[PDB]
Design a protein around this nucleic acid. Structure first.
Ligand SMILES: [Mg+2]
Ligand SMILES: [Mg+2]
Lengths: 239, 239
DNA sequence: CGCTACATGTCGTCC
DNA sequence: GGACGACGTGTAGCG
């Protein structure tokens, strides 16, 4: 219980209980390979029949159950959940959330492996190429939109909704920008169109809105044009 | 190598290589506990400094790096990535993706554990309480909306966008339904408003929009009412 | 394929 | 905690 890893293949019940309870107490990552059934009831409800999966319980209460395919866990519980090991006909991992109230139950039919990983990580992800950096680029360099553009507000609450960037053009009109870091879609335009209408109701048909994205879908283009909105091609920047 | 699980702690390089290789060849699950750095370049770009993480490679190319917090992996590749282990100053897990071009590099500074899990699973998640089931309820029992409501289409592409349920009321108006399995937000009302307008272009004032959800956010109700759109409380059914 | 919209979305960020 | 919208979103499902 100093070693980063403690692992037992084909553990007995006592061994399982010992390692599971150590993981929670030491606040380390618990990892288990097991044949299991999963029961979930919560926001939604689901059953998963008997099969082999990887189970992870993070010290912050995150609970993940992974099949041999996809990116997503087949079942999970978010940070803050409370997990208890519980003995029955078979051992059962039980994770509870109260807000909203959700129960995840993992019945462990055969545990092939259980492990405790006392992980030491002080580092945080450093990410670039986001929408937030698109905004920064525009405020530092407003001409990537158009000559004379004057960015004024970032994330301005208008009446209903929140606008990515609000500014004025060389004609003095109010300008709404809707930024997308990737190819913009129908819902991008609906967002932009929604902000613009609300603002037009105040400042007149004067108000411009501009979709700022590396590209558009066919449908985005269509709706953008039918509503008299504009498109400025812009790539999300990378430090 | 007929055991369901193979585990090596503090492996040698050749031990590391052997198990990774075997994992990929056997369509097994690879799990690694390691101190590592992560370099990602793709749709966006990111850097993660030295820290302990759980690393998972699924047979379908899904690649997950997990820290001891949250529910999301800090770095990943989705199914379809091709992974390989390169011997550099340290071993490096690579994982290239095509369309779009993405590379994920995991530098293994110290591998505390490597494991091969030959997982056997034929079962698919059975979930209830979804939006699809709201839809099915509404076709089985249209009076949950209102009497004389006749549903016609589900997931119907109109010109721009795809409508959840489309039908008529007993007064001969066209009805758009927008469904949400959870509390409805501004996004939903924007969808609904958008569909109603497009439909009004063909059929004129004879279109009704209805938001169907268990409840609304403040802004949603604000926008709903402003636009003369309706609301019917409905909870997603659980079998 | 490209487009669209759901999701037990999750997560940040303001209030 | 509710509201609001981003995310390297993932993922289905249909043209
Ligand atoms: Mg926005
Ligand atoms: Mg919809």
């Amino acid at each position: 219980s100093k070693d980063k890893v403690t692992v037992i293949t084909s553990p007995s019940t006592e061994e399982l209980v010992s390692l599971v309870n150590s993981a929670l107490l030491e606040e380390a990552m618990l990892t288990i390979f097991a044949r299991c059934k999963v029961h979930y009831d919560g926001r939604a409800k689901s059953e998963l029949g008997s099969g082999d999966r990887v189970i992870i319980v993070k010290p912050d209460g995150s609970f993940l159950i992974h099949q041999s395919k996809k990116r997503e866990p087949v079942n999970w519980q978010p940070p803050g959940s409370r997990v208890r090991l519980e003995l029955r006909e078979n051992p059962v991992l039980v994770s509870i959330r109260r807000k909203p109230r959700e129960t995840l139950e993992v019945e462990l039919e055969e545990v092939y492996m259980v492990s405790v990983f006392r992980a030491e990580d002080y580092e945080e992800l450093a990410l670039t190429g986001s929408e937030a950096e698109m905004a920064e680029l525009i405020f530092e360099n407003p001409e990537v939109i158009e000559p004379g553009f004057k960015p004024l507000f970032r994330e301005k609450a208008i009446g209903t909704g929140i606008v990515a960037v609000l500014g004025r053009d060389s004609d003095g009109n109010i300008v709404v920008l809707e930024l997308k870091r990737r190819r913009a879609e129908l819902h991008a335009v609906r967002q932009l169109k929604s902000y613009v209408e609300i603002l037009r109701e105040e400042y007149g048909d004067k108000v411009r809105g501009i979709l700022v994205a590396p590209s558009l879908t066919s449908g985005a283009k269509r709706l953008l044009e039918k509503e008299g909105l504009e498109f400025r091609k812009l790539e999300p920047p990378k430090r």
